[PDB]
Amino acid sequence: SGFRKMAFPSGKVEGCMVQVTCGTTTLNGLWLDDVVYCPRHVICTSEDMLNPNYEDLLIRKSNHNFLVQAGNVQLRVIGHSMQNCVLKLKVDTANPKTPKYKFVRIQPGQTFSVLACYNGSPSGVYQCAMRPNFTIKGSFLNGSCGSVGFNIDYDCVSFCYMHHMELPTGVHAGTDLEGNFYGPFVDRQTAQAAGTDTTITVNVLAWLYAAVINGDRWFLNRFTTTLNDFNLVAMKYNYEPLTQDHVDILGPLSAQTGIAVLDMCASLKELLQNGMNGRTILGSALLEDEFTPFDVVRQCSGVTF
Amino acid sequence: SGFRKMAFPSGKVEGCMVQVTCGTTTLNGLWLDDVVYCPRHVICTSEDMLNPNYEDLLIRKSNHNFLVQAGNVQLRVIGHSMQNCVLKLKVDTANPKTPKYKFVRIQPGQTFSVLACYNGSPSGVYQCAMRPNFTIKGSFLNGSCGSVGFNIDYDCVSFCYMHHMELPTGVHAGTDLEGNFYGPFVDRQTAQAAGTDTTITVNVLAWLYAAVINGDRWFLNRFTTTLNDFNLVAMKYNYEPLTQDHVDILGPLSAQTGIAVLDMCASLKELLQNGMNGRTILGSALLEDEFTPFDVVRQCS
Ligand SMILES: O=C1C[C@@H](C(=O)Nc2cccc(C3CC3)c2)c2cccnc2N1
Numbered sequence: 001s002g003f004r005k006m007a008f009p010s011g012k013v014e015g016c017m018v019q020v021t022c023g024t025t026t027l028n029g030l031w032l033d034d035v036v037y038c039p040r041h042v043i044c045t046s047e048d049m050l051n052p053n054y055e056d057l058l059i060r061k062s063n064h065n066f067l068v069q070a071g072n073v074q075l076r077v078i079g080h081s082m083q084n085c086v087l088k089l090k091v092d093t094a095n096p097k098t099p100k101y102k103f104v105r106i107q108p109g110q111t112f113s114v115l116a117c118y119n120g121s122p123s124g125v126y127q128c129a130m131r132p133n134f135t136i137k138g139s140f141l142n143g144s145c146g147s148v149g150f151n152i153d154y155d156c157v158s159f160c161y162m163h164h165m166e167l168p169t170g171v172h173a174g175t176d177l178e179g180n181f182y183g184p185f186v187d188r189q190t191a192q193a194a195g196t197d198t199t200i201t202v203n204v205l206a207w208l209y210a211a212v213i214n215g216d217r218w219f220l221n222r223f224t225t226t227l228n229d230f231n232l233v234a235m236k237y238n239y240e241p242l243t244q245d246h247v248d249i250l251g252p253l254s255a256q257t258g259i260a261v262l263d264m265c266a267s268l269k270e271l272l273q274n275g276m277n278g279r280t281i282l283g284s285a286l287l288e289d290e291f292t293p294f295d296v297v298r299q300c301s302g303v304t305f
Numbered sequence: 306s307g308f309r310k311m312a313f314p315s316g317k318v319e320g321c322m323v324q325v326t327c328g329t330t331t332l333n334g335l336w337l338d339d340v341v342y343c344p345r346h347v348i349c350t351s352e353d354m355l356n357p358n359y360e361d362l363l364i365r366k367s368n369h370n371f372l373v374q375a376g377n378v379q380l381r382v383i384g385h386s387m388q389n390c391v392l393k394l395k396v397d398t399a400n401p402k403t404p405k406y407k408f409v410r411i412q413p414g415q416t417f418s419v420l421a422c423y424n425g426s427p428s429g430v431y432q433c434a435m436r437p438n439f440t441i442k443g444s445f446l447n448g449s450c451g452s453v454g455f456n457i458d459y460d461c462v463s464f465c466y467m468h469h470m471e472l473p474t475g476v477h478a479g480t481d482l483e484g485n486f487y488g489p490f491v492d493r494q495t496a497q498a499a500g501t502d503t504t505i506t507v508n509v510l511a512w513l514y515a516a517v518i519n520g521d522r523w524f525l526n527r528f529t530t531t532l533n534d535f536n537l538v539a540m541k542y543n544y545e546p547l548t549q550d551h552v553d554i555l556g557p558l559s560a561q562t563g564i565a566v567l568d569m570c571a572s573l574k575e576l577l578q579n580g581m582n583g584r585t586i587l588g589s590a591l592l593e594d595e596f597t598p599f600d601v602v603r604q605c606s
């Protein structure tokens with residue numbers, strides 16, 4: 001029993017984290033095979049950050065301007081290039097701890113584990129969702145840039161996120177490992193703001209299924225609904241539309257618990273309209289939207305890595 | 306900024322997890338140097354579970370009755386002994402991935418990371434606290450026994466928990482790595498039940514200090530309180546007593562934020578009275594009690 005916000009075990013990623021230094025800037029890099037990946041903003045100083053010309057800053061650098069430290073060992077940089085907003089430093093040694101991996105771009109609503117790091121040293125791991133407004137609600141201080149997010153699908157690490165910056169609201173923005181931002185953000189010091197966020201409906205439903213599986217059933221009711229009626233309610237409460245694909249994805253949980261997705265939608269309708277009436281669900285007084293259907297099934301079935 | 310329930314990176318522990326089998330029972334063990342630690346109940350059968358006599362079950366076993374698998378490899382067991390409620394299996398290979406480590410017994414309110422494991426392979430990592438009633442609110446299925454809890458302050462892993470069982474209420478009980486249970490529990494399937502659980506007051510206060518550090522002040526008020534009046538009110542909401550030690554421990558957070566500990570106590574009293582009136586603190590609509598003072602300073606500043 002029990003249901004917790006759970007991250008993937010982080011060991012396979014821990015063996016890839018290094019420190020990257022350029023001038024007076026130190027941040028984290030990801031060392032896979034013979035390349036170190038890190039945010040291209042490592043090459044900027046204070047003045048540069050206001051309006052950087054990255055190609056022009058980069059052409060001025062030699063390999064020896066980038067100091068890469070893996071533990072207590074310096075790696076030799078033998079090449080450098082940029083891909084979108086990530087810098088790729090070719091080094092003279094392949095990482096002997098390189099896991100089986102891929103680079104994947106995730107969709108809003110999908111979850112991943114973040115390994116927060118400082119000076120190339122992993123400090124903490126936590127689970128995040130990519131918000132509908134393409135931010136993440138992370139926990140990051142000065143020095144965390146280049147921290148990465150990932151999933152593990154089998155023995156294969158899927159890297160999906162590299163941390164680039166904090167927005168003024170205190171939420172976080174970054175890129176895939178091919179250097180494309182999630183969201184309408186740019187890597188420069190200027191006023192930027194996230195869009196208004198919405199709640200991830202399919203995930204709330206997943207978590208309601210988790211609650212039922214763990215014995216917490218007070219919110220169930222005799223009623224059902226239709227997709228269109230439910231979506232009018234979702235829109236009113238700043239919930240993402242529920243699609244037929246979402247309904248299909250929750251199919252397993254529906255069959256296991258005997259509660260059809262649109263029956264559970266009728267539960268969720270009532271919760272939005274009436275609140276929780278002083279009760280909790282899985283120890284929370286708000287509706288949790290950072291577990292996917294896959295997360296719920298995985299944790300309520302004991303899958304291993 | 307931001308504030309998350311954060312676990313330690315699990316890699317140092319992952320490299321120590323093995324599978325232990327005895328008869329038809331398989332669970333997890335922790336392989337450090339040349340010893341594998343696991344719950345002694347691995348040697349029980351169905352019959353045994355109400356009133357096992359562990360010394361009598363153990364004397365009947367040989368080394369070769371214990372199968373230990375580390376990844377794809379069998380380890381050879383060359384010795385065994387029991388210490389309290391843990392079995393220690395001496396094996397013929399020291400674990401080359403053994404981290405710097407120590408065994409520490411923790412007190413209620415302390416937090417740690419759990420690496421949940423099945424068949425000797427890591428499933429997930431999450432953060433837990435030792436509740437005042439000596440249970441933890443974990444996430445554990447059949448096969449999770451022998452999963453461990455730990456902290457990593459610096460490069461040294463401090464092992465503080467090994468998982469043994471789930472109580473009827475769905476909460477979890479286990480031992481330190483010297484095999485002494487937390488709380489009044491025993492490794493038997495007799496009816497046992499945890500004490501009423503209470504809120505960890507010192508941690509709630511820590512987390513209110515975290516909210517102030519992250520720029521949120523809405524819940525403060527102009528009042529203070531004596532320690533004794535605070536405790537008289539807080540007990541009525543099932544909050545643990547706050548002690549002078551706890552007040553001392555909050556001193557650094559007090560000094561960082563400019564808010565005296567007993568003024569923060571006054572804020573908490575009002576929150577218990579009023580609720581949150583549709584607001585949140587660090588993203589929660591309930592008061593959070595699974596961050597320690599030490600955790601707050603580590604994650605914020
Ligand atoms: O998440 C973080 C990392 C880091 C940060 O946000 N840097 C940062 C901010 C704006 C723009 C840029 C770059 C693209 C041009 C980088 C930080 C420094 C100090 C305090 N908190 C944090 N939080």
Ligand SMILES: O=C1C[C@@H](C(=O)Nc2cccc(C3CC3)c2)c2cccnc2N1
Nearest residue numbers: 001346445446447469470471492493494
């Ligand atoms: O945490 C867990 C592990 C495991 C469990 O609780 N085993 C267990 C229960 C009572 C007593 C004993 C031993 C000392 C005599 C062991 C379990 C089995 C089935 C369903 N859920 C779980 N949850």
